[PDB]
Structure 1
Amino acid sequence: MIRTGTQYLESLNDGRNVWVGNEKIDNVATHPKTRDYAQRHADFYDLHHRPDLQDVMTYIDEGGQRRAMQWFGHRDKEQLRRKRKYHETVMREMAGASFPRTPDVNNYVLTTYIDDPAPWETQSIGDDGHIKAGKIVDFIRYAREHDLNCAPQFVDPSPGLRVVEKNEKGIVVNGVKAIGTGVAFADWIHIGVFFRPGIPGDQVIFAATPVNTPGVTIVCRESLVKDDKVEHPLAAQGDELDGMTVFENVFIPWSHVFHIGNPNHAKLYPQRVFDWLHYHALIRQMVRAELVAGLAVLITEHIGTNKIPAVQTRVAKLIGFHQAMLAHLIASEELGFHTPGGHYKPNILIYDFGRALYLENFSQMIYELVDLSGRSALIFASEDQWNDDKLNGWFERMNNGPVGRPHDRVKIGRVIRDLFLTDWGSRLFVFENFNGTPLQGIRMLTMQRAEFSGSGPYGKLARQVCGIDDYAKALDAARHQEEVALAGAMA
C-alpha cells in the first residue's frame, strides 16, 4: 500500500532537531511555521490515492504491487516520457510547480546507485572491505517500500563534513552540509559530495541517515509562509525551507554507507547522481515558463492591452521561451541513451543546455510579466475592501474589461504577486540558481572536456571550411555517459 499523507504527518513527530529562524520546532507537522509545507508533502502522498490520477500517479510492478511512479524505473524513451508526465502532473497539481523539491525529485536521484551500484563499493578507500553494493541496493529498496523521502545534501560552501572515527560497526562523521532544501520535512538525509581540487579523502562521503539521527541538527532560514490564504493563495500554502545540516559526531553503520575515501570517484559519479534532478529541473522550468506565459495572456487580456502590437510581441516572447524549454526537453528525450544497468537517460548535454537557457533568461521573462501587469500586480483590493458597501462599486468599475468578472483581475494579480513579488516567491527565483549546478557551472565543466575542443565534433566543420588538416570497452563508465551523450547530439 502506498504511503498516505496522514502517515507522513505522523512520522514527522520523531524528535528531529530543527531550527526555523529563531524558533525550535517541536513538531514539524503542526508548528505554524512549517505545517503548511508539511501538508503540501501530505497532499503529495494523497495524490497517489486519487482515483482520477491513478493511471498517471501509480504503476503495478512485476510483483503485482501498486506503487507510486516516483519509484518507477524507465528503460526506454516511452517509459521516460511516462515518468516525465508523472512529475509534470505532480507539479501542475501543486500550485504550478512552486515546490521544486517534492519527494519525487529528491528520490529520483537514487536511480543511479540501483543502476550501477558496484563502483561505489569497488572504488571505496579506507574502508577495510565493509561497504557492500548489495546493501546500497537494500537501502534504496527499503526507501521505495516505505515511500521514504531521502533529501539529498551534496553541495559545500574547514567545516565540511568528514569521517572522524572508523570501527567494525561503521563510521562517525562531524561537520556541516551547507545546503539542504526541505530536509526538515524528509525521512532520511542522502549525504554526498562533489569533487573539488584537493578534496581530502576523509571528506569524500556518500551515505544515508535518518533525519532524527542523534547529533543531527537541521538549521533553516525563517519561514516566508503567509497567514491569509485569500490575499496569498500560493504563499499561504507553505514554504519549502532551505538550510544547513549540522552533524555532531553522527554515527552511520557501514550498511548505510555507500562510498568513502576516493576523490577521483567524486569526479563523475555524483554528477551521474544529480543528472536526474537536473532533468527534473528542466521539466519544472518548462512548466514555470508555461505558467508565466499564461499569466501574461490572462492579465493583458483582462486589462485589454492584448491587441496592442507592442504587447503582442512581448507575450509571443514569453510563449517562445516556453517552447524553447519544451524543445530542449523533447530533444533530450529523443536523443537519450542507456546507462550501464540499462536505464534510459535523456541526453545530458541537451537538457543541461535547456537549464542554462532558462537560468540565463528567466529574470527578464519574469520582469516582462510584472511590467505587462502594470499596477494590477501590487496595488489591488484586499477582499474586505472589495466587498465593502461603499468601495465595491468603484472597484468593479476600475477592474472592468472585456473578458469576465472584474474580480478575476484581483485573482490574477494575487498570483503574479505571490510568485514574483513576495519573499516566498523571491525564494523560488533565487533557489533556481541552486537547483543542481548553476549556469556558470554547466558551462565550465562542459568546456573542460576534450570533446568540446577543436579535436571534437565542433571543430570538424570549421576545420574543412578553413582548409585545416559499450561499457565493456570503456574504462570509465560515468565518463562514457558524457561522451555517448555528445555522440547522440552531434549525429
Structure 2
Amino acid sequence: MRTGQQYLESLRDGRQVYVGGELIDDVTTHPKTSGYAKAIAEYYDLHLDPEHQDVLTFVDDDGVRKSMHWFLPRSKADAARRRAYHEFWFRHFQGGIFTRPPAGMHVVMYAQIDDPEPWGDNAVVAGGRTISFADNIRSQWQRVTTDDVALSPMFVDVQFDVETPMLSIVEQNDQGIVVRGWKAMGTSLPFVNELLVGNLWRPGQTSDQTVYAIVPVNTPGLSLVCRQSNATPDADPYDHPLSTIGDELDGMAYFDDVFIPWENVQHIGNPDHAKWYPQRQFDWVHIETQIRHAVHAELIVGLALLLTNALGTNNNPIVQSQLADLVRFRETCKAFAIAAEETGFTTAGGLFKPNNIYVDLGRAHYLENIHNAVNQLIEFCGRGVVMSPTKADFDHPFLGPKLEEALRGTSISARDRVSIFRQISERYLTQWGARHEMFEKFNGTPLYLVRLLTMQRTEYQVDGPLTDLARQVLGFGDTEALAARAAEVEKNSNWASV
C-alpha cells in the first residue's frame, strides 16, 4: 500500500507528457497538472488512514492488507462492499468530479485475472514462438498488487476507415514485440505508472492490430498527447471551487516503435478475441460508472433543494413538481444499481459479477436524461448564472457591503447564496466542468450503442423469453412454427403470387 509521497515520486520518471501542446517536465510540480497529482496522492494516503480501513482496505488470503482497488469480489456481500468503496470515492471527489482514480481504472483487470487461460489459448503469435500469456497475466497481477502500481486503460482506436495509424505490431522477436501507432483515448495518463493497452473489436481489425499489453508510461518511444488543462491553481477558490483542485486530463498516446517484452504481453493477434473478452473487462467500469451516476444525481437534487430554498421558490408547485422528478431521477439510477447487484451471479472462476443488463440500462437511463436534469437545475438559478459577484466584488470596500446587502436572502447571506450559483456554474457552465459531462457521455458504451447491444442479447431476440407472454396471448408457436403454418396456407391453396 503506497503513500502519497511514493505515488508522487513514481511520476517523476522521464515520461513524455504534452498538455495543450506544452511539454511537461514534471507533472508533480507544473501548474497545469500538480493539483490532480496531489489529489491522487491524497487518495493513496487515505487508504492508510486507520479510520477508513474498514471501507478502503481488505486483508487478503496471505494475510497482507491491500487497497480495495485490488479486491476481486466473491459474493453479493463482496460486491456490496465494492459499491461502498466506489461510493466513498465519488463522495470524496464531491460527487464524482474525477471519474478515474485508480479505483475506477484497475477494475478493467478483474475479468482477465479471473479467466486468463483463453487470453493465451486464443493468442496469435509468429515464428512458432510459445509465450505463456496466462502466466504473464498472473505474474502481472501479482506484480501490480504487490507494488501498488497505478494503471490506466487505453482500448479505443482511431477511426481509420497500407499500414494504418492505429497501433499495430511491426516486429516480433525472441525478446518481445515492437508496436507503432496511436491509441485514441485514455484518462489520467500523465498520473499513472503503466498503461493497460487493448482493443475493442471493430470491423476490419487485423491480426497485427490486436494487442493487449502492460506498458510503462516512461517507455522509450511513448508520447502522451493530452488536452489543454482547465486547472486554475491561482484562481480564488470562492470564484472557482473545483477547477482550483486540479483537472483529470484526457488524451491520446503515440507509440514510436515502442518495445514491449513478452512478459508484459497478455494477448496478440486474434481479432475474434477482441469481440467478447474486452467487453467483460468494461462491464466492471460500467458497474462503478453506474454507481457514480446515482451519486451525481444525488448531488444535483441536493443542490436543487438548497438552491430553490435559498431563493424562496421551493414552495411553487411547479418547482416542487420538478424537484420531485429530480428525486425520481436519482432513485431510478439507484434502483438499477441494486437490481444489478441482487441479480448478479458468479463466473466460472468464482468472480461475483453484477447483472450487466441492469448496469447497462441504468446507464442508458442516466445517459438519456442527465442533460435534462442539469438543465432543470440551471433553470432554477435564474440570472445568477449570467452574472454573480466574484470574491473581489464582495471585498470592494464600498461596493462590497452594498453587494452583500442587495443579494442576501431571507435566511442566507449573499456570499453563501452566490456560492450556490458558482458551484453550479463550475460544474455545468465552464470548460473545466463541461469535460465531466462530456466524459460521462462518451466514455463507456454510449447510449446509441447500449441500444444496439441490448437488442443483440439473447434475452431480447424475437424467439427469446421476452416474447413468451405475447406468444401465449396470441396462441403462437415460435418463429419456425408460425412460418410452417404460413407455408401450408400457401401450399393448400390456389394463388397467382405463389
Q: TM-score, normalised by structure 1?
A: 0.93
Partner of 1:425: 433
Asked whether 1:206 is paired with 2:220, we answer: no
Instruction: Specify the code of the residue in structure 1 equivalent to 2:122.
Output: Q
In the aligned structure 2, how far is the partner of 1:4 from the partner of 1:399?
45
Asked whether 1:410 is paired with 2:418, we answer: yes
Instruction: Specify the code of the residue in structure 2 equivalent to 1:71.
Output: W
Asked whether 1:332 is paired with 2:331, we answer: no
Matches within 5 A, 1:35-184: 35-127=34-126, 128-157=129-158, 158-184=164-190
Cα offset, 1:66, TM superposition: 1.8
In the aligned structure 1, how far is the partner of 2:88 from the partner of 2:445?
25
Cα offset, 1:31, TM superposition: 0.8
Residues 293 and 319 in structure 1, CA contact (< 8 A), matched pair in contact too = yes
1:354 corresponds, among 355, 362, 371, to 362
Asked whether 1:392 is paired with 2:391, we answer: no
Asked whether 1:29 is paired with 2:28, we answer: yes
Residues 301 and 403 in structure 1, CA contact (< 8 A), matched pair in contact too = no
State the structure with more CA Rg.
2
Q: Secondary structure at the match of 1:297?
A: helix
Q: Secondary structure at the match of 1:217?
A: strand
Cα offset, 1:235, TM superposition: 1.3
Asked whether 1:185 is paired with 2:185, we answer: no
In the aligned structure 1, how far is the partner of 2:52 from the partner of 2:38?
19
In the aligned structure 1, how far is the partner of 2:141 from the partner of 2:406?
57
Asked whether 1:306 is paired with 2:314, we answer: yes
In the aligned structure 2, how far is the partner of 1:403 from the partner of 1:55?
39
Residues 152 and 192 in structure 1, CA contact (< 8 A), matched pair in contact too = yes
Residues 133 and 267 in structure 2, CA contact (< 8 A), matched pair in contact too = no
Cα offset, 1:184, TM superposition: 1.1
Instruction: Specify the code of the residue in structure 2 equivalent to 1:323.
Output: E
Q: Which runs of 5+ in 2 are unaligned?
A: 159-163, 478-498
Partner of 1:483: none
In the aligned structure 2, how far is the partner of 1:434 from the partner of 1:142?
32
Matches within 5 A, 1:376-391: 376-391=384-399
In the aligned structure 2, how far is the partner of 1:50 from the partner of 1:403?
38
Instruction: Specify the code of the residue in structure 1 equivalent to 2:441.
Output: N
Instruction: Specify the code of the residue in structure 2 equivalent to 1:169.
Output: Q
- Identity over the aligned pairs, expressed in percent? 46
Q: Secondary structure at the match of 2:97?
A: coil
Partner of 1:480: none
Partner of 1:460: 468
Partner of 2:490: none
Partner of 1:222: 228
In the aligned structure 2, how far is the partner of 1:233 from the partner of 1:62?
42
Asked whether 1:341 is paired with 2:342, we answer: no
Q: Secondary structure at the match of 1:155?
A: coil
Q: Secondary structure at the match of 2:48?
A: coil
Residues 454 and 460 in structure 1, CA contact (< 8 A), matched pair in contact too = no
Cα offset, 1:378, TM superposition: 4.0
In the aligned structure 1, how far is the partner of 2:166 from the partner of 2:152?
18
Q: Secondary structure at the match of 1:376?
A: helix
Q: How many pairs does the alignment contain? A: 468
In the aligned structure 2, how far is the partner of 1:401 from the partner of 1:344?
51
Cα offset, 1:456, TM superposition: 0.5
Residues 131 and 259 in structure 1, CA contact (< 8 A), matched pair in contact too = no
Instruction: Specify the code of the residue in structure 1 equivalent to 2:145.
Output: R
Asked whether 1:282 is paired with 2:300, we answer: no
Partner of 2:264: 256
More deviation, 303-312/40-49: 40-49
Residues 400 and 406 in structure 1, CA contact (< 8 A), matched pair in contact too = yes
Residues 278 and 435 in structure 1, CA contact (< 8 A), matched pair in contact too = no
Residues 329 and 350 in structure 1, CA contact (< 8 A), matched pair in contact too = yes
Q: Secondary structure at the match of 2:442?
A: coil
Q: Secondary structure at the match of 1:258?
A: strand
Cα offset, 1:444, TM superposition: 1.1
Residues 419 and 425 in structure 1, CA contact (< 8 A), matched pair in contact too = yes
Partner of 1:472: none
Instruction: Specify the code of the residue in structure 2 equivalent to 1:455.
Output: D
Cα offset, 1:350, TM superposition: 0.4
In the aligned structure 1, how far is the partner of 2:397 from the partner of 2:35?
33
Residues 376 and 409 in structure 1, CA contact (< 8 A), matched pair in contact too = no
Q: Which runs of 5+ in 1 are unaligned?
A: 470-491
RMSD of aligned alpha carbons: 1.3
In the aligned structure 2, how far is the partner of 1:231 from the partner of 1:53?
32
Cα offset, 1:198, TM superposition: 2.2
In the aligned structure 2, how far is the partner of 1:402 from the partner of 1:468?
67
